[PDB]
Amino acid sequence: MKAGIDEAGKGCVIGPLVVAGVACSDEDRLRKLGVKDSKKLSQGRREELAEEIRKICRTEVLKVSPENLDERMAAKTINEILKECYAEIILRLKPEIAYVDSPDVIPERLSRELEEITGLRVVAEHKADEKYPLVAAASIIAKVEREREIERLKEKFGDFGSGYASDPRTREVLKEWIASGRIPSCVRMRWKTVSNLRQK
Incomplete structure (x- = not known):
C-alpha cells in the first residue's frame, strides 16, 4: 500500500x-x-x-x-x-x-x-x-x-495553555514555573524559549 x-x-x-x-x-x-x-x-x-x-x-x-x-x-x-x-x-x-x-x-x-x-x-x-x-x-x-x-x-499541572510559545497563557505560566525553580517535567528544557527565559 x-x-x-x-x-x-x-x-x-x-x-x-x-x-x-x-x-x-x-x-x-x-x-x-x-x-x-x-x-x-x-x-x-x-x-x-x-x-x-x-x-x-x-x-x-x-x-x-x-x-x-x-x-x-x-x-x-x-x-x-x-x-x-x-x-x-x-x-x-x-x-x-x-x-x-x-x-x-x-x-x-x-x-x-x-x-x-x-x-x-x-x-x-x-x-x-x-x-x-x-x-x-x-x-x-x-x-x-x-x-x-x-x-x-x-x-495534573493546571491549565498551561496550548503548550506553544505563542499562547500568552503558556508563556505566562512558563515564567512563573521557572521563577519557582521547580519546573514540571513536561517542559522541554533544551527549548530556546526556556533557555532565554532562564538566562534572564
Whole structure:
C-alpha cells in the first residue's frame, strides 16, 4: 500500500512530539471520511475522526517525551530527530511509497536521506497534509494523540495553555514555573524559549 506520515507538537515548549503513519488499502474509503478538510474540526470531532481512521487503515504512532527530546537534542536538531521518527514509522509500515511532511520548504534532501535510510520510496513536501489524504489522516492521528497527552498533563499541572510559545497563557505560566525553580517535567528544557527565559 501507500502511506502518509506527519507529526504534531514539533514546535511546542511543553508536551511530547507525536509522529504517526497511516496506511490504507482503500484510499477512497479514507476520502469519504472527509480527511481533506479535517482542519475545521473541533478537538472532539477530530477525535471521532481519528477513531474512524484507525478502523479502516493501519496506524503507527510514536511519541517522544520532553525528557527524551531534551536528551537527543544535545547531539541533534529537532528536524533531524523528526526524520529519525519518520524513518522508524516508515519501516514499521513498509509501504510501497511513503509521503511525508517536510519541516523545510525544500523537500528534496529529506526525501533523499529518508530513502537512503529506509531503502524505500519516499516523497516529502512542506505542508503535505494539505495535499495528500494519507498525510492528512496521519496528521489527524498525531494531533489527537498529542492533545490527549496535553489534556492528561493539564489535569495534573493546571491549565498551561496550548503548550506553544505563542499562547500568552503558556508563556505566562512558563515564567512563573521557572521563577519557582521547580519546573514540571513536561517542559522541554533544551527549548530556546526556556533557555532565554532562564538566562534572564
